[PDB]
Amino acid sequence: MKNIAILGASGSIGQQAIDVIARHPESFNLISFTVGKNIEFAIEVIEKFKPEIVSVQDEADVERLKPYHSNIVSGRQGLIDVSTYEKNDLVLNALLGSVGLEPTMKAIEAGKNIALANKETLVVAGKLVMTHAKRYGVDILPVDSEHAAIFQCLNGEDMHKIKNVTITASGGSFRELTREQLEHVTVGDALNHPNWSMGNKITIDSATMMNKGFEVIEAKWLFDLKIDQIKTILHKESIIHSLVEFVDTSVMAQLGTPDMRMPIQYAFTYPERIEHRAPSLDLVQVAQLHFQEMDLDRYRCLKFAYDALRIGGSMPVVLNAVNEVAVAKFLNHEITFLEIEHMIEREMSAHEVIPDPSLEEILEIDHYYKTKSYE
């Protein structure tokens, strides 16, 4: 048996990881998990999976759960408790935004392997989080279409012989608009995403191209690449999930239907793969696959991400913190769509960067930008 911890269990990635657990009672177990605010979901999981400890993200909800369960934690500590439980053999982080940083930190400290779906952990503190993995003898296991993809293409490969990697972008809801028309998009239209869903924050990030920019950074720390090693390309159908090129011009791609359970389960069964009872990718049905050169004028958020990469230090913490606040304000009909872009540029032009932020200053800056006034 492997004992699995799910951090973001009430989310898209978390749900899909519970199905995987529900498709393999023989090899997996759900030992601990975390929700936020979807308490009905928690009761369903507790009455099916028999987990030992559950954490809510708000204390008032503890006693809605206390009949069904006895070991109920809550809040900030409730996260570390569920990610550091000693019966944990593997921790899956499906939290969004930097809320997930601190628990993987404390989980690593406890010598526990990490399947990492939470992107911004590596965006705000990649290099901090990696050099912590070495030193505790724990590995970081990507669970994210684009990065699970790169990962499998490197099996039996010397990472030293990578020329570049290319990360594929679907282009989000507004891929067939020019900025001119973007003055006119509603929240409803932004939420109607092409290829996956995945929840609302990822859907807007995908339309902003922040999602890919976050992943170009995550990829720099996973695979130890340079800025010129990271390319992007626009792939409408989202079949090819990424591709790496080696110094001998051989190029490797991984393919699938936009379904997250495969990368999740491989991150549970590495380096063995086991059967996944689901329809296979039928290249004959898809008929054709498109590729267009990335446009950095149409998606300036991907240019900011590159810029947060080449400045370094604490600039990535700001790009993430303000994006978290800009996307929330957009979904609450507080700002317009192109506002997300302009909000981000401001705080970055002003940021006084810290070269090698420790954890506490990273969590500091992130707090400053999430509670600052945007007027």
Ligand X SMILES: O=CN(O)CCCP(=O)(O)O
* Residue 121 sits in the site that holds ligand X (CB under 6 A): no
Residue among 107, 153, 169, 225 that touches ligand X (CB under 6 A): 169
* Residue 373 sits in the site that holds its own copies (CB under 8 A): no
Specify the residue, 24 or 212, whose C-beta has the smaller distance to ligand X: 212
Of 29, 296, 362, 338, residue with least CA distance to 190: 338
- For ligand X (CB under 6 A), the number of binding residues is 13
Give the interface segment with ligand X, choosing from 47-55, 74-82, 138-146, 244-252 (CB under 6 A): 138-146
**Residue 253 CB, nearest distance to its own copies (Å)?**
5
Report the C-alpha gap between 235 and 255 in whole angstroms: 12
**Spatial contact of 159 and 221, defined as CB atoms under 8 Å apart:** no
Q: Which of residues 122-151 bind its own copies (CB under 8 A)?
A: none
What's the one-letter identity of residue 234?
A: L
Burial category of 199 from C-beta neighbours within 10 Å (exposed 0-12, middle 13-18, buried 19 and up)? middle
Specify the residue, 11 or 51, whose C-beta has the smaller distance to ligand X: 11
Q: How many CA atoms lie within 13 A of 308 on its CB side?
A: 34
Report the C-alpha gap between 46 and 69 in whole angstroms: 8
Report the C-alpha gap between 70 and 52 in whole angstroms: 8
* Residue 211 sits in the site that holds ligand X (CB under 6 A): yes
Give the Cβ contact number of residue 78 at 10 Å: 21
* Residue 145 sits in the site that holds ligand X (CB under 6 A): yes
Specify the residue, 62 or 101, whose C-beta has the smaller distance to ligand X: 101
Give the Cβ contact number of residue 273 at 10 Å: 11
Specify the residue, 98 or 170, whose C-beta has the smaller distance to ligand X: 170
Report the C-alpha gap between 236 and 104 in whole angstroms: 34
* Residue 195 sits in the site that holds ligand X (CB under 6 A): yes
**Spatial contact of 152 and 232, defined as CB atoms under 8 Å apart:** no
**Spatial contact of 313 and 335, defined as CB atoms under 8 Å apart:** no
Residue among 248, 297, 360, 375 that touches its own copies (CB under 8 A): 248
274 touches, from ligand X, its own copies, none (C-beta below 5 to 8 Å by class): its own copies
**Residue 349 CB, nearest distance to ligand X (Å)?**
26
**Residue 152 CB, nearest distance to its own copies (Å)?**
6
Residue among 62, 73, 108, 202 that touches ligand X (CB under 6 A): 202
Give the interface segment with ligand X, choosing from 143-151, 219-227, 301-309, 315-323 (CB under 6 A): 143-151
What's the one-letter identity of residue 305?
A: A
Instruction: Report the chain's terminal Cα–Cα distance, integer Å.
Output: 53
Give the interface segment with ligand X, choosing from 59-67, 144-152, 293-301, 333-341 (CB under 6 A): 144-152
Of 120, 127, 32, 110, residue with least CA distance to 72: 32
Name 156's Cβ contacts closer than 8 Å, sequence gap at least 6: none
Report the C-alpha gap between 113 and 90 in whole angstroms: 5
**Residue 9 CB, nearest distance to its own copies (Å)?**
22
211 touches, from its own copies, ligand X, none (C-beta below 5 to 8 Å by class): ligand X
Which residues in this chain contact ligand X in the complex, by CB under 6 A? Answer: 144-146, 169-170, 172, 195-196, 202, 206, 211-212, 238
Which residues in this chain contact its own copies in the complex, by CB under 8 A? Answer: 152-158, 161, 163, 166, 233, 240, 243, 245-257, 259, 262, 265-266, 269, 272-276, 278-281, 283-284, 286-293
